[PDB]
Amino acid sequence: GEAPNQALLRILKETEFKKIKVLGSGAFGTVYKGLWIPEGEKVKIPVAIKELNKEILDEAYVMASVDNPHVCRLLGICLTSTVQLITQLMPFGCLLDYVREHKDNIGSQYLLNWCVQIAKGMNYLEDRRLVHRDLAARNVLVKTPQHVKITDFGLAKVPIKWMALESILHRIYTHQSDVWSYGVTVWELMTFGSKPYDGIPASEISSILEKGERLPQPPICTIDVYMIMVKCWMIDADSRPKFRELIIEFSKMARDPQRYLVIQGDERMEDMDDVVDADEYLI
Numbered sequence: 001g002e003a004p005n006q007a008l009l010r011i012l013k014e015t016e017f018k019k020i021k022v023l024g025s026g027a028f029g030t031v032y033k034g035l036w037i038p039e040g041e042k043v044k045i046p047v048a049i050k051e052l053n054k055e056i057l058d059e060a061y062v063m064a065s066v067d068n069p070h071v072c073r074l075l076g077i078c079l080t081s082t083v084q085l086i087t088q089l090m091p092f093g094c095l096l097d098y099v100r101e102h103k104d105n106i107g108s109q110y111l112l113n114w115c116v117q118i119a120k121g122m123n124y125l126e127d128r129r130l131v132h133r134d135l136a137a138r139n140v141l142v143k144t145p146q147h148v149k150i151t152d153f154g155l156a157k158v159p160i161k162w163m164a165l166e167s168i169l170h171r172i173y174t175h176q177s178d179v180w181s182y183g184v185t186v187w188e189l190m191t192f193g194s195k196p197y198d199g200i201p202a203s204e205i206s207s208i209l210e211k212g213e214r215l216p217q218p219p220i221c222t223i224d225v226y227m228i229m230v231k232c233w234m235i236d237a238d239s240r241p242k243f244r245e246l247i248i249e250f251s252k253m254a255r256d257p258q259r260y261l262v263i264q265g266d267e268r269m270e271d272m273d274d275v276v277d278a279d280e281y282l283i
């Protein structure tokens with residue numbers, strides 16, 4: 001029923017990349033800020049290098065199969081004694097931290113454009129018949145403040161406060177259950193990083209949603225924006241919007257940003273000669 005997955009998985013020599021600095025230490029892995037120089041190609045590509053296995057290779061398998069401006073991509077892997085994944089560096093970190101750090105300087109144009117790009121990347125995953133199951137502001141990376149990407153397909157094929165009701169109850173996951181988390185994600189951005197249902201036990205979340213309660217309208221949010229969030233959180237999943245509609249809706253609003261989001265002050269907010277961004281390095 002499926003078409004053959006003709007993705008290419010690139011194996012890289014460890015002498016082809018050098019690790020400059022550390023970005024994260026996690027029980028699963030440690031990740032390095034680094035640089036990748038394909039052999040005799042006279043390019044240096046800024047990369048994130050992950051060191052730790054059926055998990056890490058499943059992750060690599062998925063990332064090698066996606067090609068989209070708003071989805072993270074795998075550049076290659078190294079079958080070193082400790083297996084290494086080589087991915088594109090996202091200099092500004094994850095969007096959740098970004099939004100918390102710079103709230104006093106984030107305008108409505110930026111917020112709405114991010115909603116467009118995540119909708120684009122998620123619509124792409126739907127095209128690829130792929131289901132993310134962990135979309136959240138913590139899993140959107142920032143390449144430039146103008147360009148974000150969806151990341152962390154650890155669960156692609158547990159975060160209850162981002163989860164659709166069907167998912168909490170029956171462990172069902174859909175593109176439409178992804179739309180729910182898109183709404184929760186949008187809510188994280190419009191509240192500038194607040195935690196959803198803060199100070200609530202996860203065990204209660206299922207009953208609360210069944211009662212008809214949801215997350216509050218963020219102060220900067222016109223009802224136009226909040227209506228879109230609310231529709232992403234309907235019980236009936238064929239009632240929620242399609243990602244392709246979310247693209248259209250947020251794109252309309254991104255034309256007149258100030259009409260949809262009201263933000264105080266919103267109006268006015270050694271050798272690197274051969275470095276190329278991975279987005280322009282093609283094979």
Ligand SMILES: CCC(=O)N1CCC[C@H](n2c(=O)c(-c3cccc(F)c3Cl)c(C)c3cnc(Nc4ccc(N5CCN(C)CC5)c(C)c4)nc32)C1
Pocket residue numbers: 023024025031048049050059072085086087088089090091092093094097138139141151152153
């Ligand atoms: C959720 C964010 C998160 O905390 N961490 C843990 C460490 C990096 C991790 N991280 C990946 O896991 C992955 C990834 C995803 C899937 C598979 C795979 F092999 C990989 Cl490598 C990628 C692509 C990645 C790309 N760019 C980047 N830039 C980046 C990260 C952190 C920072 N900091 C450090 C300084 N300040 C203390 C705060 C902010 C900065 C400035 C840039 N970080 C990436 C994810």
